[PDB]
Amino acid sequence: TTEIHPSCVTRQKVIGAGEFGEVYKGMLKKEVPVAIKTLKAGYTEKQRVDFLGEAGIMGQFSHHNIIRLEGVISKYKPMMIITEYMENGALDKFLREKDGEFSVLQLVGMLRGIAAGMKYLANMNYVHRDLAARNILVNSNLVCKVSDFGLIPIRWTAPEAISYRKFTSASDVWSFGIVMWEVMTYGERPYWELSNHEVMKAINDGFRLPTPMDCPSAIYQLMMQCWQQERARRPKFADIVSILDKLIRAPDSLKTLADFDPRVSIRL
Ligand SMILES: Cc1ccc(C(=O)Nc2cccc(C#N)c2)cc1Nc1nc(-c2cccnc2)nc2c1cnn2C
Structure with missing residues (x-):
């Protein structure tokens, strides 16, 4: 320093x-x-x-x-x-104030960047423990910088970190999955109005966040594998970076979208 x-x-x-x-x-x-x-x-x-x-x-x-x-x-x-100083500020507020303003490739690129920073932290043996859009800063090139501003983020935290305080890179991967969902939804609150206890119960009962609107199938599949209950079955950040990099560099791969589950039916 x-x-x-x-x-x-x-x-x-x-x-x-x-x-x-x-x-x-x-x-x-x-x-x-x-x-x-x-x-x-x-x-x-x-x-x-x-x-x-x-x-x-x-x-x-x-x-x-x-x-x-x-x-x-x-x-x-x-x-x-x-x-x-990052004039665009924190990613969560940034996305919510810019709803729909970016391309799918720009959004996935943000995630590739976050993933690359997290791979670096994990490789350096630094466990973040608080990975969330609120702790990511955005510069004027749309580059995402992992940060930590301080605080309990139950909805972002892996079951083993909640249950018995086992914080590792693999619990950071779970958080990264949530960040993936925050980005593709433009800053929606994970699990919407569910209480902290309702979130834990849903996750233990096997439920997972539904696909964001207009979300590449490959991207939804990746965030779903970050949310494996079994810590050992989750991708490592090296896997995440590599997949995001291959997806961006073959962008037609992002044109196939996961089906969105309508919460409302409108018949005309
Ligand atoms: C000065 C400073 C000191 C520490 C850290 C930090 O990230 N520490 C750290 C520790 C451990 C691990 C990792 C990682 N990986 C990172 C970040 C900053 N800088 C910012 N922080 C805030 C901010 C806002 C409200 C309340 N608190 C902070 N806003 C900022 C900036 C820059 N621009 N803006 C708009």
């Missing part, structure tokens, strides 16, 4: 909250816009370890689909984690 001097950072507006300090939009010195998470006076030992630990792992990550760390302020207070 590069150490940034405080005089090179200007905090402008609050954009969120952190573990113990706000998150700001600002500028980094010609000037590059940035996101800034602070650790404010009074932070605890554990908070400092988690903060500087977070900064450390982020500085290790160098991938096109992982949020880029610009630097850290650790020598002065407040301490700071400073990343690139």
Whole structure:
């Protein structure tokens, strides 16, 4: 991690909250816009370890689909984690505000990118545990950067992580399946109005999310295999990336759509 001097950072507006300090939009010195998470006076030992630990792992990550760390302020207070700024913001809100505005190839391409970042994290032995559209940022090239803003996301979490806290790359794959469904539905809420308990019961009873509208059959098949109850039967991120890459590079493959199950009948 590069150490940034405080005089090179200007905090402008609050954009969120952190573990113990706000998150700001600002500028980094010609000037590059940035996101800034602070650790404010009074932070605890554990908070400092988690903060500087977070900064450390982020500085290790160098991938096109992982949020880029610009630097850290650790020598002065407040301490700071400073990343690139993504003007299109988080993917979930982005898609819901742009309903229907993209091609199927653009949507699958977003997913290929998310998958590539997740393969990198899994290969680096980093378990995300909170993969969801809300933690993915979009840049002005439509490139998706995996991030983590903090919080329990029952609807995004694999049964074994819920039941007995077994978080692994394979539970991240389940979450990726949900992200796949979020993308192809333009940010619909998974399981709609079902309660957290109703979701767990449906999944244990064997039900799975239905196909999104206008969704390539191959894409629905892939997200369904991310939701295997048996962790060992789920694809690895390497499998996911490879399938998405072959689909994009042979785009007629996406023209075959899964049947959509109408929830309403209109007869004319
Ligand atoms: C500054 C910063 C610090 C940490 C992280 C982060 O992803 N940490 C991390 C830890 C562990 C694993 C992985 C991974 N893989 C990633 C991200 C950012 N940056 C952003 N965060 C927020 C934001 C908004 C509201 C509340 N909290 C945060 N909005 C942003 C940006 C950039 N642009 N915008 C619009």
